Every structure is written in structure tokens, then in C-alpha cells.
Structure 1
């Protein structure tokens, strides 16, 4: 019951996620690991890879005033801080809900602003490891952040927001694009200007200067427009010279110069690249007179261009350690030392033990690859209908044969003896090539999606588009049987080492196990959330497990199954794209899995409540009156130092706090709580009622609990002494408040009577005739009995 573990992972330079950094090293993002290359020699320096995390990394930032510390933002919402000296994560920050997308650092590097796709921007302290605060604007996702202190951000709702940081609320907003979306932000390093790139190819230009009045900081000084009308991915400024680079996700990067805003900014140069660039970045090398623009493409490459300031040359490139588009097939050697990977545009064969590429060929499209025994030559069936043949040791192309006319070779299987190969195509036929010379063909009803042989070369099995499988005999091609019951067409199949089992992977999201004597389905087992691409048995039963098989599907999963006990024994995660191909070793000890990820991998009490609030307010009143006496003596520094509950509730007055704790309780509970209150607690309540009536708020509640206090303690008040003083104060204050409120409402009702009579006088009638029958609210009021 031996499981599988990730041991190796390779075949990848920069992913389609954003944010390349330069340091003469290029620090880019592979899927979950952030890896740093030399650009001069193609050997990577290091990889930063964490065992606790699996989510993909999508934002990189270099700290200023201290390189060899970096901030990476992942897909789950976490941030890690790495070192380039030692490849560990010193601190981790789990603050956001989803998908960190833009990082930013302070000038001093003690403060870190991270804006997500869940639209929160959270700023982080780097000496206390506490989430400082959470700035909250922005209808949808934030696409630009910068530290000006002050913060300047821009979001996908086309708003630039200028936030303060001493008082954590926004000072300014402006709307960059009227009906579009502001997509990128670029700040001048001296904070004089900011240009924001919008959806139409329009670049808006803003000038920056360096509360009760009209505050005006950002000014739309003009609009610019670039050449290509795409959603612009980034705007990067030169840290030293007067240039910037604007690019969308396309094959052009437009470098403009800093000398109307159209007179201020002119395009210096337009750089064409061989692939769609995802993120450009700037590089300045010590001792050169140039501009080292480092582009990182979506098509799996880094390019360093030299731009002459006062044309482009493809100066440096990193393409050897990765396939450039997308791996469609893998086929690993009989000696299991090297493997071949077949991608659209290329063949690249690799060593397992060193995980470094050895040979490279160019083909048009590469559906299916498999080498011939002796591992000297390889076979590739392409989309255009042909079968190409290459060889490893001399690294060349031997032969090419138009197998089918324009119909893609969907299946290639080498004979287990090793003298023939079979190509099943997108035409109806499936052809046999003996070595290569065409020996026998097989015409069948529909397009053959996948065919495989038997390990003892006895029976063949094609798998059509008609959602069916035809198992034939190998010697003469007579129909042995056919397997049915698939709702959607069969994508793959693999049959057992003794030919007593077939697994059959379909597009209806399940795999089937057939017995291959009588072809009875053993058990249809629904095991994947999407259409299962491929299946493979481990070939050797030397280890006692030959009836186990792997299945790889579009839901980013491999699954290790047991066909004897019909049970999933392991679930293999770790791929971030739809896994297209996989293969197992001939020893079966490891397997390779090649994805849409472009990374091929190798696997081995109410009254007591108001009473304590009364006491809190009483201590607050004593501290405030002592602070009044101190500030009356001298204007020296005197802190009141009130309760942390008050400075956490927000420096409210004790009157407001005790009013809220009297307001929260329902009226019957208020009656019971004031009844349960003792006469030691009564005088504090009477002082706070004096405070309410002085600073009038909830006068009916104040009078209600005051008359309840007097009526439930009338004898004790008229026997005590200090109640005379505080009750005289509350009498004067309450009588003034009641007389003020009553006189205001009396003036209101008298004025409403006067204006109502005047409006009646306006309304009465104009004409006079014989019929004064022209000169009332009515309600309905149903009642059941």
C-alpha cells in the first residue's frame, strides 16, 4: 500500500501570473515556487518552495533599502516574506479572503501594502507582525498600489483613490475612465506624476503635489493613447532615467520617453517580441550605457532586451529549461534514465536524474510521441496528419511519412516486441507501420481517439468517437468483442500486464474496468469531477501490485486506484492546470505527469451590568475633573489615561457609554434592573441623570428612570443629605431641558396652525356660481365581527 510523493518538478520558467522582479538575476514565478535565474548563464540560482502551501504564487515585490528579503502574494490570500540569502519564509501573513494581486513596499521597508481581488487592501507592519489596519473603498478589485504617509491606489471600477494613513480614510477620489476600467498604474519615482492605463488603450496622466476646505491633490492634466487597443497589463517607470514602458498582454512593449501632455510624452521605441509578454520589468546593469528591459512572456520565456537611449536587439533569452507552449505527450525511456516531452512547436527530451534538458527538436504540432526500443529514435504523430521520426544520439530528423492526409494521429502505440508501430488517426482508418513500411490498415466506423495493445502481443483495442471500444485480435483483425456503456467518447485506455483487465477513461467523467474474458464491466466507478484524460497501469507485478492504475483528469487530479479491491488508494494533488499527459515507469517506481500548468512533475445580569457601567463612568468623571484642574493650573502635558475599553470604543464620553448601556435593555428589564440597583449605586445614577439633562439626550428615558428612582426611594432620599445638592442640580437641569423642548414644540404647532389656515385661505375657491356643492380624509378600518 505504498503511496506517492512529489520528488521532482521542472520544465518551467515564468508562468502566466504577473510581476517579474530584477535584482543580474531575474526573479520570476513558477506556479507555487518562486524561482530565481541568472540571465547570463541559463542555470537557475534557486527555488523558493514551501511544504505547507500548495496554492499558486501571483505577486512578487522587492523590499527597498534591503534586498534579500521579498514579499510574495499567493492565490489563497497569503503573503510570505522570503530571503535570498537563505531560502526560508521568515513571516507569513494570512489576512485576505482571496487572491493577492498587487504588492507595494514603503520607502523605509517597514510597512507593506497588499491589495487583493477580494478588494481589500491591507497594510502590514514588519516589526510587530500584526495586521495594522484595513482600508476599505473600491467597488471591485485593486489593480494598482503605491506609497507616496499617503497611499495612492487604483481599482477596476476605474477609480484612483488617494488614501491617508495617519487617519485611515480616503482623502481624494477621481475617476480615470468614464465607461471603462483603469487597468494599470505607474508612478514617477519622484512622485511628480502618475499615469493610469485604461481599457481602450488610453493612458490618463495625473500630476501630484508634494481637511475642512476643498482638498485638491490629483489633477487630470491630460490623456494619452498608445498604439494597441488592448487591456494594458502594466506601466513601469525607470528608477533612474526618464523612460517608462507600457504593455498589455500582447507581443509589443511600448517604451515612451519623458522630455500639452502629448508634447511631454513621445514614444521612444516599440519592441516586438516573439511571444505574448505578461510582465515587463526594468533592469539597470552596472557599467553599461543602455536600458535592460526584461520581459517575461506568457509563452514560457524570459527575454532581456537592450534599448539604446538617444532600436531593440534580442540580447539575452532563457528558453532551454522549458517547453515554450504546452506539453501534450510524455514518453519515458526503457532504461528510465531520460524522457521525451512532445509539445506544440517542439520536442524536448530531459534527464530524470539531473532534471535538466538534453536535446531539442522542432516539430509542428505534437499529439503523440513514443520512442522505439533501444531508445535511439522517437516517433511523433502530429496534427497535420503526418508521422515524423527523430533520433536522440545524433539529434536529427530521419524520416517523415504522410500517414493520414490532414487528420491528426490521435494514437500511437509501439508493438511490445518492438518491430511495428500503429497510428490511429482523425480519419476512419488506423495504419500499421513495420520497420518504416506500411503493412496492414484497418478501416473502422469513426475517428479513432485512442488505441492500445496487449503486453503479451495478442489483442488490440481501439477506442472510437462513437463512445465505444473495439477489442480486436492482433494476428488477424477480427472483432473479438466490443465494449459499450459510455455516455461520452472514450479518451484513453490501459490494459493489464496479463491482459485480464482493461480500464477505459471517458469524457463522461468516469472510468470502466472490463475483464477481457467476455468483456463484462467489473465496476463502473465515478471518480473525477471532470472528463478523465488518461489512465495507465504499472507494468511490473514484481512488487506485488500490478493491478493498480493511475488516472489523470481535467480537474487537476491524478488518482491511484486498485482494480482488485476496486478502491482509490491515493489522491494526487499538486497540479494547477488540466493535466494532459502522464506516463509511468517501466520499473513503475516513479511516474511523470505533464499539465496545462506547463510543469511536468515526477512522483516517487442587567442590573449588575448597568451598575458596573455606572462605576466605570464614575471613575472616568473623576479622572476628567482632575485633568481639568491640571490643565487649568498649567498647559503642560497631562494625559487623562482613561480605560482601554473607552479608548477601544473610540474615546466616547462616559455619558454616551452609560446612556448606551441604559438604552440597550428592553423596558421591562429596565424596570427590574433599576429596582435591583442598590442605594450605594443610586447617587452615581443621579449624577449621570444630571449629566443627561444638562447635555439633553433621551429626555423621556432620563425622566422615566429618574421618577422611578425617586418613587422607589422616596424616604431614603428625604433622609439623606448629599442628595439635596445633586437633586437640586438635576432639578434645575431637567426643568430647563423640559421647558426648552416644550417651548420649541409649542412654537412648531402654533406655526403649523397659522400656515395651515393661510393655506386654506389660498385654497378656498375662485369662481362664484349657484352651485357651492363643490365645497376630508377617510380610512377603511375593517373589523371581523
Structure 2
């Protein structure tokens, strides 16, 4: 019951996620690991890879005033801080809900602003490891952040927001694009200007200067427009010279110069690249007179261009350690030392033990690859209908044969003896090539999606588009049987080492196990959330497990199954794209899995409540009156130092706090709580009622609990002494408040009577005739009995 573990992972330079950094090293993002290359020699320096995390990394930032510390933002919402000296994560920050997308650092590097796709921007302290605060604007996702202190951000709702940081609320907003979306932000390093790139190819230009009045900081000084009308991915400024680079996700990067805003900014140069660039970045090398623009493409490459300031040359490139588009097939050697990977545009064969590429060929498209025994030559069936043949040791192309006319070779299987190969195509036929010379063909009803042989070369099995499988005999091609019951067409199949089992992977999201004597389905087992691409048995039963098989599907999963006990024994995660191909070793000890990820991998009490609030307010009143006496003596520094509950509730007055704790309780509970209150607690309540009536708020509640206090303690008040003083104060204050409120409402009702009579006088009638029958609210009021 031996499981599988990730041991190796390779075949990848920069992913389609954003944010390349330069340091003469290029620090880019592979899927979950952030890896740093030399650009001069193609050997990577290091990889930063964490065992606790699996989510993909999508934002990189270099700290200023201290390189060899970096901030990476992942897909789950976490941030890690790495070192380039030692490849560990010193601190981790789990603050956001989803998908960190833009990082930013302070000038001093003690403060870190991270804006997500869940639209929160959270700023982080780097000496206390506490989430400082959470700035909250922005209808949808934030696409630009910068530290000006002050913060300047821009979001996908086309708003630039200028936030303060001493008082954590926004000072300014402006709307960059009227009906579009502001997509990128670029700040001048001296904070004089900011240009924001919008959806139409329009670049808006803003000038920056360096509360009760009209505050005006950002000014739309003009609009610019670039050449290509795409959603612009980034705007990067030169840290030293007067240039910037604007690019969308396309094959052009437009470098403009800093000398109307159209007179201020002119395009210096337009750089064409071989692939769609995802993120450009700036590089300045010590001792050169140039501009080292480092582009990182979506098509799996880094390019360093030299731009002459006062044309482009493809100066440096990193393409050897990765396939450039997308791996469609893998086929690993009989000696299991090297493997071949077949991608659209290329063949690249690799060593397992060193995980470094050895040979490279160019083909048009590469559906299916498999080498011939002796591992000297390889076979590739392409989309255009042909079968190409290459060889490893001399690294060349031997032969090419138009197998089918324009119909893609969907299946290639080498004979287990090793003298023939079979190509099943997108035409109806499936052809046999003996070595290569065409020996026998097989015409069948529909397009053959996948065919495989038997390990003892006895029976063949094609798998059509008609959602069916035809198992034939190998010697003469007579129909042995056919397997049915698939709702959607069969994508793959693999049959057992003794030919007593077939697994059959379909597009209806399940795999089937057939017995291959009588072809009875053993058990249809629904095991993947999407259409299962491929299946493979481990070939050797030397280890006692030959009836186990792997299945790889579009839901980013491999699954290790047991066909004897019909049970999933392991679930293999770790791929971030739809896994297209996989293969197992001939020893079966490891397997390779090649994805849409472009990364091929190798696997081995109410009254007591108001009473304590009364006491809190009483201590607050004593501290405030002592602070009044101190500030009356001298204007020296005197802190009141009130309760942390008050400075956490927000420096409210004790009157407001005790009013809220009297307001929260329902009226019957208020009656019971004031009844349960003792006469030691009564005088504090009477002082706070004096405070309410003085600073009038909830006068009916104040009078209600005051008359309840007097009526439930009338004898004790008229026997005590200090109640005379505080009750005289509350009498004067309450009588003034009641007389003020009553006189205001009396003036209101008298004015409403006057204006109502005047409006009646306006309304009465104009004409006079014989019929004064022209000169009332009515309600309905149903009642059941």
C-alpha cells in the first residue's frame, strides 16, 4: 500500500501570473515556487518552495533599502516574506479572503501594502507582525498600489483613490475612465506624476503635489493613447532615467520617453517580441550605457532586451529549461534514465536524475510521441496528419511519412516486441507501420481517439468517437468483442500486464474496468469531477501490485486506484492546470505527469451590568475633573489615561457609554434592573441623570428612570443629605431641558396652525356660481365581527 510523493518538478520558467522582479538575476514565478535565474548563464540560482502551501504564487515585490527579503502574494490570500540569502519564509501573513494581486513596499521597508481581488487592501507592519489596519473603498478589485504617509491606489471600477494613513480614510477620489476600467498604474519615482492605463488603450496622466476646505491633490492634466487597443497589463517607470514602458498582454512593449501632455510624452521605441509578454520589468546593469528591459512572456520565456537611449536587439533569452507552449505527450525511456516531452512547436527530451534538458527538436504540432526500443529514435504523430521520426544520439530528423492526409494521429502505440508501430488517426482508418513500411490498415466506423495493445502481443483495442471500444485480435483483425456503456467518447485506455483487465477513461467523467474474458464491466466507478484524460497501469507485478492504475483528469487530479479491491488508494494533488499527459515507469517506481500548468512533475445580569457601567463612568468623571484642574493650573502635558474599553470604543464620553448601556435593555428589564439597583449605586445614577439633562439626550428615558428612582426611594432620599445638592442640580437641569423642548414644540404647532389656515385661505375657491356643492380624509378600518 505504498503511496506517492512529489520529488521532482521542472520544465518551467515564468508562468502566466504577473510581476517579474530584477535584482543580474531575474526573479520570476513558477506556479507555487518562486524561482530565481541568472540571465547570463541559463542555470537557475534557486527555488523558493514551501511544504505547507500548495496554492499558486501571483505577486512578487522587492523590499527597498534591503534586498534579500521579498514579499510574495499567493492565490489563497497569503503573503510570505522570503530571503535570498537563505531560502526560508521568515513571516507569513494570512489576512485576505482571496487572490493577492498587487504588492507595494514603503520607502523605509517597514510597511507593506497588499491589495487583493477580494478588494481589500491591507497594510502590514514588519516589526510587530500584526495586521495594522484595513482600508476599505473600491467597488471591485485593486489593480494598482503605491506609497507616496499617503497611499495612492487604483481599482477596476476605474477609480483612483488617494488614501491617508495617519487617519485611515480616503482623502481624494477621481475617476480615470468614464465607461471603462483603469487597468494599470505607474508612478514617477519622484512622485511628480502618475499615469493610469485604461481599457481602450488610453493612458490618463495625473499630476501630484508634494481637511475642512476643498482638498485638491490629483489633477487630470491630460490623456494619452498608445498604439494597440488592448487591456494594458502594466506601466513601469525607470528608477533612474526618464523612460517608462507600457504593455498589455500582447507581443509589443511600448517604451515612451519623458522630455500639452502629448508634447511631454513621445513614444521612444516599440519592441516586438516573439511571444505574448505578461510582465515587463526594468533592469539597470552596472557599467553599461543602455536600458535592460526584461520581459517575461506568457509563452514560457524570459527575454532581456537592450534599448539604446538617444532600436531593440534580442540580447539575452532563457528558453532551454522549458517547453515554450504546452506539453501534450510524455514518453519515458526503457532504461528510465531520460524522457521525451512532445509539445506544440517542439520536442524536448530531459534527464530524470539531473532534471535538466538534453536535446531539442522542432516539430509542428505534437499529439503523440513514443520512442522505439533501444531508445535511439522517437516517433511523433502530429496534427497535420503526418508521422515524423527523430533520433536522440545524433539529434536529427530521419524520416517523415504522410500517414493520414490532414487528420491528426490521435494514437501511437509501439508493438511490445518492438518491430511495428500503429497510428490511429482522425480519419476512419488506423495504419500499421513495420520497420518504416506500411503493412496492414484497418478501416473502422469513426475517428479513432485512442488505441492500445496487449503486453503479451495478442489483442489490440481501439477506442472510437462513437463512445465505444473495439477489442480486436492482433494476428488477424477480427472483432473479438466490443465494449459499450459510455455516455461520452472514450479518451484513453490501459490494459493489464497479463491482459485480464482493461480500464477505459471517458469524457463522461468516469472510468470502466472490463475483464477481457467476455468483456463484462467489473465496476463502473465515478471518480473525477471532470472528463478523465488518461489512465495507465504499472507494468511490473514484481512488487506485488500490478493491478493498480493511475488516472489523470481535467480537474487537476491524478488518482491511484486498485482494480482488485476496486478502491482509490491515493489522491494526487499538486497540479494547477488540466493535466494532459502522464506516463509511468517501466520499473513503475516513479511516474511523470505533464499539465496545462506547463510543469511536468515526477512522483516517487442587567442590573449588575448597568451598575458596573455606572462605576466605570464614575471613575472616568473623576479622572476628567482632575485633568481639568491640571490643565487649568498649567498647559503642560497631562494625559487623562482613561480605560482601554473607552479608548477601544473610540474615546466616547462616559455619558454616551452609560446612555448606551441604559438604552440597550428592553423596558421591562429596565424596570427590573433599576429595581435591583442598590442605594450605593443610586447617587452615581443621579449624577449621570444630571449629565443627561444638562447635555439633553433621551429626555423621556431620563425622566422615566429618574421618577422611578425617586418613587422607589422616596424616604431614603428625604432622609439623606448629599441628595439635596445633586437633586437640586438635576431639578434645575431637567426643568430647563423640559421647558426648552416644550417651548420649541409649542412654537412648531402654533406655526403649523397659522400656515395651515393661510393655505386654506389660498385653497378656498375662485369662481362664484349657484352651485356651492363643490365645497376630508377617510380610512377603511375593517373589523371581523
The question of a shared fold, defined as TM-score above 0.5 by the shorter chain, is answered with yes
Aligned to 2:205, the other structure's residue is in SS state strand
Q: Aligned-pair distance for 1:256?
A: 0.0
Aligned to 2:104, the other structure's residue is in SS state strand
C-alpha distance in structure 1 between counterparts of 2:566 and 2:318, whole Å: 46
Q: Aligned-pair distance for 1:124?
A: 0.0
Q: Aligned-pair distance for 1:764?
A: 0.0
The question of 1:149 aligning with 2:123 is answered: no
Q: Aligned-pair distance for 1:156?
A: 0.0
The Cα offsets for residues 534-555 of structure 1, whole Å up to 9 and x where unpaired, read as 0000000000000000000000
Q: Aligned-pair distance for 1:436?
A: 0.0
C-alpha distance in structure 1 between counterparts of 2:658 and 2:125, whole Å: 35
Q: Give the structure 2 partner of residue 254 of structure 1.
A: 254
The Cα offsets for residues 266-294 of structure 1, whole Å up to 9 and x where unpaired, read as 00000000000000000000000000000
Q: Aligned-pair distance for 1:299?
A: 0.0
What are the equivalent positions in structure 2 for 1:274-353 lying under 5 Å apart?
Answer: 274-353=274-353
C-alpha distance in structure 2 between counterparts of 1:340 and 1:275, whole Å: 24
The Cα offsets for residues 556-596 of structure 1, whole Å up to 9 and x where unpaired, read as 00000000000000000000000000000000000000000
Q: Aligned-pair distance for 1:68?
A: 0.0
Aligned to 2:101, the other structure's residue is in SS state strand
The Cα offsets for residues 61-83 of structure 1, whole Å up to 9 and x where unpaired, read as 00000000000000000000000
Q: Aligned-pair distance for 1:716?
A: 0.0
Q: Aligned-pair distance for 1:343?
A: 0.0
Q: Aligned-pair distance for 1:529?
A: 0.0
C-alpha distance in structure 2 between counterparts of 1:633 and 1:373, whole Å: 100
C-alpha distance in structure 2 between counterparts of 1:648 and 1:149, whole Å: 23
Q: Aligned-pair distance for 1:220?
A: 0.0
C-alpha distance in structure 1 between counterparts of 2:346 and 2:79, whole Å: 36
C-alpha distance in structure 2 between counterparts of 1:748 and 1:97, whole Å: 53
C-alpha distance in structure 2 between counterparts of 1:537 and 1:519, whole Å: 18
Q: Aligned-pair distance for 1:166?
A: 0.0
Aligned to 2:587, the other structure's residue is in SS state coil
Aligned to 1:636, the other structure's residue is in SS state coil
Q: Give the structure 2 partner of residue 426 of structure 1.
A: 426
The Cα offsets for residues 647-704 of structure 1, whole Å up to 9 and x where unpaired, read as 0000000000000000000000000000000000000000000000000000000000
The question of 1:515 aligning with 2:515 is answered: yes
Aligned to 1:560, the other structure's residue is in SS state strand
List alignment gaps of at least 5 residues for structure 2: none
Q: Aligned-pair distance for 1:509?
A: 0.0
C-alpha distance in structure 1 between counterparts of 2:717 and 2:406, whole Å: 107
The question of 1:586 aligning with 2:596 is answered: no
C-alpha distance in structure 2 between counterparts of 1:577 and 1:653, whole Å: 57
C-alpha distance in structure 2 between counterparts of 1:405 and 1:319, whole Å: 32
Aligned to 1:637, the other structure's residue is in SS state coil
C-alpha distance in structure 2 between counterparts of 1:721 and 1:332, whole Å: 101
Q: Aligned-pair distance for 1:618?
A: 0.0
C-alpha distance in structure 1 between counterparts of 2:176 and 2:209, whole Å: 18
Q: Aligned-pair distance for 1:521?
A: 0.0
Aligned to 1:539, the other structure's residue is in SS state coil
Q: Aligned-pair distance for 1:154?
A: 0.0
Q: Give the structure 2 partner of residue 439 of structure 1.
A: 439
Q: Aligned-pair distance for 1:120?
A: 0.0
Paired residue total: 785
What are the equivalent positions in structure 2 for 1:631-650 lying under 5 Å apart?
Answer: 631-650=631-650
Q: Aligned-pair distance for 1:130?
A: 0.0
The question of 1:756 aligning with 2:745 is answered: no
Q: Aligned-pair distance for 1:163?
A: 0.0
Q: Aligned-pair distance for 1:636?
A: 0.0
Aligned to 1:737, the other structure's residue is in SS state helix
C-alpha distance in structure 1 between counterparts of 2:137 and 2:562, whole Å: 53
Q: Aligned-pair distance for 1:605?
A: 0.0
Aligned to 1:457, the other structure's residue is in SS state coil
Aligned to 1:230, the other structure's residue is in SS state coil
Q: Aligned-pair distance for 1:34?
A: 0.0
Aligned to 2:568, the other structure's residue is in SS state strand
Aligned to 1:541, the other structure's residue is in SS state coil
Q: Aligned-pair distance for 1:226?
A: 0.0
Q: Aligned-pair distance for 1:177?
A: 0.0
Aligned to 2:81, the other structure's residue is in SS state strand
C-alpha distance in structure 1 between counterparts of 2:183 and 2:671, whole Å: 60
Flag as ranges the 4+ runs of structure 1 deviating above 4 A: none
Q: Aligned-pair distance for 1:616?
A: 0.0
Q: How large is the RMSD of aligned CA atoms in angstroms?
A: 0.0
Q: Aligned-pair distance for 1:512?
A: 0.0
C-alpha distance in structure 1 between counterparts of 2:232 and 2:664, whole Å: 53
C-alpha distance in structure 2 between counterparts of 1:760 and 1:697, whole Å: 37
The Cα offsets for residues 94-153 of structure 1, whole Å up to 9 and x where unpaired, read as 000000000000000000000000000000000000000000000000000000000000
Aligned to 2:614, the other structure's residue is in SS state helix
Q: Aligned-pair distance for 1:178?
A: 0.0
Q: Aligned-pair distance for 1:752?
A: 0.0
Q: Aligned-pair distance for 1:54?
A: 0.0
C-alpha distance in structure 2 between counterparts of 1:396 and 1:327, whole Å: 20
C-alpha distance in structure 1 between counterparts of 2:746 and 2:294, whole Å: 78
List alignment gaps of at least 5 residues for structure 1: none
TM-score by length of 1: 1.00
Q: Aligned-pair distance for 1:254?
A: 0.0
Q: Aligned-pair distance for 1:445?
A: 0.0
C-alpha distance in structure 2 between counterparts of 1:64 and 1:352, whole Å: 39
The question of 1:462 aligning with 2:457 is answered: no
Aligned to 1:303, the other structure's residue is in SS state strand
C-alpha distance in structure 1 between counterparts of 2:564 and 2:533, whole Å: 22
Q: Aligned-pair distance for 1:359?
A: 0.0
Q: Aligned-pair distance for 1:326?
A: 0.0
C-alpha distance in structure 2 between counterparts of 1:218 and 1:38, whole Å: 40
C-alpha distance in structure 2 between counterparts of 1:75 and 1:696, whole Å: 53
The Cα offsets for residues 39-72 of structure 1, whole Å up to 9 and x where unpaired, read as 0000000000000000000000000000000000
Q: Give the structure 2 partner of residue 75 of structure 1.
A: 75
Aligned to 1:407, the other structure's residue is in SS state coil
C-alpha distance in structure 2 between counterparts of 1:512 and 1:561, whole Å: 12
Aligned to 2:289, the other structure's residue is in SS state coil
Aligned to 2:516, the other structure's residue is in SS state coil
Aligned to 1:739, the other structure's residue is in SS state helix
C-alpha distance in structure 1 between counterparts of 2:242 and 2:255, whole Å: 11
The Cα offsets for residues 445-480 of structure 1, whole Å up to 9 and x where unpaired, read as 000000000000000000000000000000000000
Q: Aligned-pair distance for 1:723?
A: 0.0
Q: Aligned-pair distance for 1:348?
A: 0.0
C-alpha distance in structure 1 between counterparts of 2:385 and 2:186, whole Å: 49
C-alpha distance in structure 1 between counterparts of 2:378 and 2:399, whole Å: 11
Q: Aligned-pair distance for 1:322?
A: 0.0
C-alpha distance in structure 2 between counterparts of 1:298 and 1:756, whole Å: 75
The Cα offsets for residues 364-415 of structure 1, whole Å up to 9 and x where unpaired, read as 0000000000000000000000000000000000000000000000000000
C-alpha distance in structure 1 between counterparts of 2:281 and 2:219, whole Å: 27
Q: Aligned-pair distance for 1:32?
A: 0.0
C-alpha distance in structure 2 between counterparts of 1:626 and 1:504, whole Å: 86
C-alpha distance in structure 1 between counterparts of 2:32 and 2:476, whole Å: 51
Q: Aligned-pair distance for 1:780?
A: 0.0
TM-score by length of 2: 1.00
Q: Aligned-pair distance for 1:526?
A: 0.0
Q: Aligned-pair distance for 1:330?
A: 0.0
The Cα offsets for residues 335-358 of structure 1, whole Å up to 9 and x where unpaired, read as 000000000000000000000000
C-alpha distance in structure 2 between counterparts of 1:765 and 1:380, whole Å: 100
Q: Give the structure 2 partner of residue 717 of structure 1.
A: 717
Q: Aligned-pair distance for 1:776?
A: 0.0
C-alpha distance in structure 2 between counterparts of 1:546 and 1:264, whole Å: 72
The Cα offsets for residues 251-276 of structure 1, whole Å up to 9 and x where unpaired, read as 00000000000000000000000000
The question of 1:617 aligning with 2:617 is answered: yes
Aligned to 1:97, the other structure's residue is in SS state coil
Aligned to 2:530, the other structure's residue is in SS state coil
The question of 1:450 aligning with 2:455 is answered: no
The Cα offsets for residues 148-172 of structure 1, whole Å up to 9 and x where unpaired, read as 0000000000000000000000000
Q: Aligned-pair distance for 1:16?
A: 0.0
Aligned to 1:485, the other structure's residue is in SS state coil
C-alpha distance in structure 1 between counterparts of 2:245 and 2:197, whole Å: 11
The Cα offsets for residues 739-771 of structure 1, whole Å up to 9 and x where unpaired, read as 000000000000000000000000000000000
